PDB file of all heavy atoms in Angstrom:
ATOM      1  N   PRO C 122      29.415  87.150   8.124  1.00 14.85           N
ATOM      2  CA  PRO C 122      29.256  88.195   7.104  1.00 14.85           C
ATOM      3  C   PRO C 122      30.582  88.700   6.566  1.00 14.85           C
ATOM      4  O   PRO C 122      31.607  88.676   7.246  1.00 14.85           O
ATOM      5  CB  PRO C 122      28.537  89.317   7.862  1.00 14.85           C
ATOM      6  CG  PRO C 122      29.033  89.163   9.285  1.00 14.85           C
ATOM      7  CD  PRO C 122      29.208  87.661   9.491  1.00 14.85           C
ATOM      8  N   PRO C 152      20.817  86.327  14.131  1.00 16.87           N
ATOM      9  CA  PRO C 152      20.983  87.757  13.854  1.00 16.87           C
ATOM     10  C   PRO C 152      22.437  88.219  13.820  1.00 16.87           C
ATOM     11  O   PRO C 152      23.334  87.478  14.215  1.00 16.87           O
ATOM     12  CB  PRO C 152      20.273  88.391  15.043  1.00 16.87           C
ATOM     13  CG  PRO C 152      20.729  87.500  16.179  1.00 16.87           C
ATOM     14  CD  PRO C 152      20.882  86.082  15.582  1.00 16.87           C
ATOM     15  N   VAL C 153      22.656  89.456  13.371  1.00 12.66           N
ATOM     16  CA  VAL C 153      23.918  90.159  13.574  1.00 12.66           C
ATOM     17  C   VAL C 153      23.626  91.373  14.440  1.00 12.66           C
ATOM     18  O   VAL C 153      22.517  91.918  14.419  1.00 12.66           O
ATOM     19  CB  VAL C 153      24.604  90.622  12.266  1.00 12.66           C
ATOM     20  CG1 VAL C 153      25.173  89.452  11.495  1.00 12.66           C
ATOM     21  CG2 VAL C 153      23.646  91.447  11.424  1.00 12.66           C
ATOM     22  N   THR C 154      24.629  91.801  15.195  1.00 10.77           N
ATOM     23  CA  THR C 154      24.566  93.062  15.918  1.00 10.77           C
ATOM     24  C   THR C 154      25.638  93.994  15.373  1.00 10.77           C
ATOM     25  O   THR C 154      26.727  93.549  14.998  1.00 10.77           O
ATOM     26  CB  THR C 154      24.764  92.864  17.422  1.00 10.77           C
ATOM     27  OG1 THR C 154      26.084  92.369  17.666  1.00 10.77           O
ATOM     28  CG2 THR C 154      23.745  91.872  17.967  1.00 10.77           C
ATOM     29  N   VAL C 155      25.321  95.283  15.308  1.00 12.50           N
ATOM     30  CA  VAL C 155      26.258  96.295  14.844  1.00 12.50           C
ATOM     31  C   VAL C 155      26.288  97.401  15.884  1.00 12.50           C
ATOM     32  O   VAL C 155      25.234  97.867  16.324  1.00 12.50           O
ATOM     33  CB  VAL C 155      25.862  96.878  13.470  1.00 12.50           C
ATOM     34  CG1 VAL C 155      26.895  97.889  13.025  1.00 12.50           C
ATOM     35  CG2 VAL C 155      25.729  95.777  12.431  1.00 12.50           C
ATOM     36  N   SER C 156      27.482  97.805  16.285  1.00 12.14           N
ATOM     37  CA  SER C 156      27.653  99.036  17.040  1.00 12.14           C
ATOM     38  C   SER C 156      28.659  99.905  16.302  1.00 12.14           C
ATOM     39  O   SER C 156      29.287  99.473  15.335  1.00 12.14           O
ATOM     40  CB  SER C 156      28.111  98.751  18.475  1.00 12.14           C
ATOM     41  OG  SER C 156      29.460  98.331  18.490  1.00 12.14           O
ATOM     42  N   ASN C 200      31.365  97.813  14.409  1.00  2.00           N
ATOM     43  CA  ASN C 200      31.717  96.567  15.084  1.00  2.00           C
ATOM     44  C   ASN C 200      30.581  95.595  14.823  1.00  2.00           C
ATOM     45  O   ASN C 200      29.463  95.798  15.304  1.00  2.00           O
ATOM     46  CB  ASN C 200      31.924  96.783  16.581  1.00  2.00           C
ATOM     47  CG  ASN C 200      32.569  98.124  16.899  1.00  2.00           C
ATOM     48  OD1 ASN C 200      31.907  99.044  17.381  1.00  2.00           O
ATOM     49  ND2 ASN C 200      33.872  98.233  16.651  1.00  2.00           N
ATOM     50  N   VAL C 201      30.853  94.561  14.040  1.00  2.00           N
ATOM     51  CA  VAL C 201      29.834  93.612  13.621  1.00  2.00           C
ATOM     52  C   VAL C 201      30.075  92.310  14.369  1.00  2.00           C
ATOM     53  O   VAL C 201      31.202  91.801  14.396  1.00  2.00           O
ATOM     54  CB  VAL C 201      29.855  93.402  12.098  1.00  2.00           C
ATOM     55  CG1 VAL C 201      28.777  92.400  11.695  1.00  2.00           C
ATOM     56  CG2 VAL C 201      29.679  94.751  11.365  1.00  2.00           C
ATOM     57  N   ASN C 202      29.028  91.788  14.994  1.00  2.00           N
ATOM     58  CA  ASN C 202      29.126  90.537  15.732  1.00  2.00           C
ATOM     59  C   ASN C 202      28.068  89.582  15.202  1.00  2.00           C
ATOM     60  O   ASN C 202      26.891  89.941  15.110  1.00  2.00           O
ATOM     61  CB  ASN C 202      28.949  90.773  17.238  1.00  2.00           C
ATOM     62  CG  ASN C 202      29.248  89.533  18.062  1.00  2.00           C
ATOM     63  OD1 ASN C 202      29.696  88.513  17.535  1.00  2.00           O
ATOM     64  ND2 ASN C 202      29.012  89.619  19.366  1.00  2.00           N
ATOM     65  N   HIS C 203      28.496  88.380  14.827  1.00  2.00           N
ATOM     66  CA  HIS C 203      27.611  87.322  14.357  1.00  2.00           C
ATOM     67  C   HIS C 203      27.885  86.117  15.261  1.00  2.00           C
ATOM     68  O   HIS C 203      28.813  85.342  15.018  1.00  2.00           O
ATOM     69  CB  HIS C 203      27.861  87.014  12.880  1.00  2.00           C
ATOM     70  CG  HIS C 203      26.918  86.003  12.304  1.00  2.00           C
ATOM     71  ND1 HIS C 203      27.349  84.818  11.746  1.00  2.00           N
ATOM     72  CD2 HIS C 203      25.568  85.998  12.207  1.00  2.00           C
ATOM     73  CE1 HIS C 203      26.303  84.133  11.317  1.00  2.00           C
ATOM     74  NE2 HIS C 203      25.211  84.827  11.584  1.00  2.00           N
ATOM     75  N   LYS C 204      27.089  85.979  16.315  1.00  2.00           N
ATOM     76  CA  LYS C 204      27.345  84.927  17.297  1.00  2.00           C
ATOM     77  C   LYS C 204      27.160  83.510  16.749  1.00  2.00           C
ATOM     78  O   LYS C 204      27.871  82.606  17.192  1.00  2.00           O
ATOM     79  CB  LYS C 204      26.473  85.125  18.543  1.00  2.00           C
ATOM     80  CG  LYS C 204      26.304  86.583  18.961  1.00  2.00           C
ATOM     81  CD  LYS C 204      25.135  86.772  19.924  1.00  2.00           C
ATOM     82  CE  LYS C 204      23.816  86.309  19.310  1.00  2.00           C
ATOM     83  NZ  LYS C 204      23.030  87.437  18.730  1.00  2.00           N
ATOM     84  N   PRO C 205      26.243  83.250  15.809  1.00  2.00           N
ATOM     85  CA  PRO C 205      26.135  81.871  15.297  1.00  2.00           C
ATOM     86  C   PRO C 205      27.391  81.357  14.612  1.00  2.00           C
ATOM     87  O   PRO C 205      27.637  80.145  14.640  1.00  2.00           O
ATOM     88  CB  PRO C 205      24.947  81.946  14.330  1.00  2.00           C
ATOM     89  CG  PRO C 205      24.121  83.061  14.867  1.00  2.00           C
ATOM     90  CD  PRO C 205      25.100  84.070  15.366  1.00  2.00           C
ATOM     91  N   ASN C 207      30.447  82.708  15.460  1.00  2.00           N
ATOM     92  CA  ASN C 207      31.521  83.224  16.307  1.00  2.00           C
ATOM     93  C   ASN C 207      32.450  84.152  15.525  1.00  2.00           C
ATOM     94  O   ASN C 207      33.675  84.078  15.619  1.00  2.00           O
ATOM     95  CB  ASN C 207      32.297  82.082  16.959  1.00  2.00           C
ATOM     96  CG  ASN C 207      31.957  81.921  18.416  1.00  2.00           C
ATOM     97  OD1 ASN C 207      32.461  82.654  19.266  1.00  2.00           O
ATOM     98  ND2 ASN C 207      31.074  80.974  18.717  1.00  2.00           N
ATOM     99  N   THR C 208      31.848  85.043  14.742  1.00  2.00           N
ATOM    100  CA  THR C 208      32.583  85.990  13.916  1.00  2.00           C
ATOM    101  C   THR C 208      32.392  87.391  14.475  1.00  2.00           C
ATOM    102  O   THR C 208      31.263  87.793  14.772  1.00  2.00           O
ATOM    103  CB  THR C 208      32.105  85.935  12.463  1.00  2.00           C
ATOM    104  OG1 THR C 208      32.387  84.639  11.918  1.00  2.00           O
ATOM    105  CG2 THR C 208      32.815  87.003  11.616  1.00  2.00           C
ATOM    106  N   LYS C 209      33.491  88.126  14.626  1.00  2.00           N
ATOM    107  CA  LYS C 209      33.449  89.538  14.993  1.00  2.00           C
ATOM    108  C   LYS C 209      34.370  90.299  14.054  1.00  2.00           C
ATOM    109  O   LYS C 209      35.513  89.890  13.837  1.00  2.00           O
ATOM    110  CB  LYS C 209      33.866  89.773  16.452  1.00  2.00           C
ATOM    111  CG  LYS C 209      33.040  89.007  17.472  1.00  2.00           C
ATOM    112  CD  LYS C 209      33.735  88.948  18.830  1.00  2.00           C
ATOM    113  CE  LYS C 209      32.871  89.557  19.931  1.00  2.00           C
ATOM    114  NZ  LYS C 209      33.692  90.220  20.984  1.00  2.00           N
ATOM    115  N   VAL C 210      33.862  91.387  13.481  1.00  2.00           N
ATOM    116  CA  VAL C 210      34.593  92.193  12.514  1.00  2.00           C
ATOM    117  C   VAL C 210      34.491  93.651  12.927  1.00  2.00           C
ATOM    118  O   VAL C 210      33.398  94.134  13.234  1.00  2.00           O
ATOM    119  CB  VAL C 210      34.051  92.009  11.081  1.00  2.00           C
ATOM    120  CG1 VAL C 210      34.924  92.762  10.087  1.00  2.00           C
ATOM    121  CG2 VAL C 210      33.999  90.530  10.717  1.00  2.00           C
TER     122      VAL C 210
END
Side-chain angles (χ1 to χ4, degrees):
Chain C
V153 288
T154 64
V155 182
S156 73
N200 324 106
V201 180
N202 189 6
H203 184 239
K204 321 163 301 263
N207 255 280
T208 296
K209 303 163 122 213
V210 185

